[PDB]
Design a protein around this ligand. Structure first.
Ligand SMILES: COCCCNc1ncnc2[nH]cnc12
Length: 208
């Protein structure tokens, strides 16, 4: 049923830096997530250029932003390439170990947390605002899985039996009590317009 895994030491360490460092400019989190989705959408676009049957699981390539005031969640959905069980376990497709290193050293030499994306670990920026992150994903070559973590040193991976998604990734941010601003329409609009205004995929903000 539910398998539990430990983060590689470097990622436990990244995640603790993101949760504990005093940093007010939390909003970059959305930019990094949206940008992860665009990369996933590139990836499925490219694959499909030579094998059009990869798009059998969904031809539309888009990103949705879904706030929910009652569950206290913001969810970023894309119909990108999605992840296999193995990529999920292996730091969600990232070079997280060396990325954390190159990040760490950028911070020694002048950088700030907003540069996180440049080291291929932007995903973890979700912990700027989320206390728990759930990631549901479906790649063509595999089943649908959910990855989960309230940080703390460990993640879980189960096969997901709820709503079949087709193909792609859903990053559910279970928001911290004091960051409910990121559920506001106006606030999300502001951030998309500020940081993600030239992303090559439609981005729909859902209403409640
Ligand atoms: C490179 O990002 C690392 C974590 C997220 N990686 C991802 N992989 C596949 N589809 C996605 N959709 C959004 N993020 C995705």
């Amino acid at each position: 049923e539910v398998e539990t895994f430990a983060f590689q030491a470097e990622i436990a360490q990244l995640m603790s830096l993101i949760i504990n460092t005093f940093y007010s400019n939390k909003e970059i989190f959305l930019r990094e997530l949206i940008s992860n989705s665009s990369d996933a959408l590139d990836k499925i676009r490219y694959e499909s250029l030579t094998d059009p049957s990869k798009l059998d699981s969904g031809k539309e390539l888009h990103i949705n932003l879904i706030p929910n005031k009652q569950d206290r969640t913001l969810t970023i959905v894309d119909t990108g390439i999605g992840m296999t069980k193995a990529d999920l376990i292996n730091n969600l497709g990232t070079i997280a170990k060396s990325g954390t290193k190159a990040f760490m050293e950028a911070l020694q030499a002048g950088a700030d947390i907003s540069m996180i994306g440049q080291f291929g670990v932007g995903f973890y920026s979700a912990y700027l605002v989320a206390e728990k992150v759930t990631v549901i994903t479906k790649h063509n070559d595999d089943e649908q899985y959910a990855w989960e973590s309230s940080a703390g040193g460990s993640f879980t991976v189960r096969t997901d039996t709820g709503e079949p998604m087709g193909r792609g990734t859903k990053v559910i941010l279970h928001l911290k009590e004091d960051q409910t601003e990121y559920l506001e329409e106006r606030r999300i609009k502001e951030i998309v317009k500020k940081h993600s205004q030239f992303i090559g995929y439609p981005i729909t903000l859902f209403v409640e």
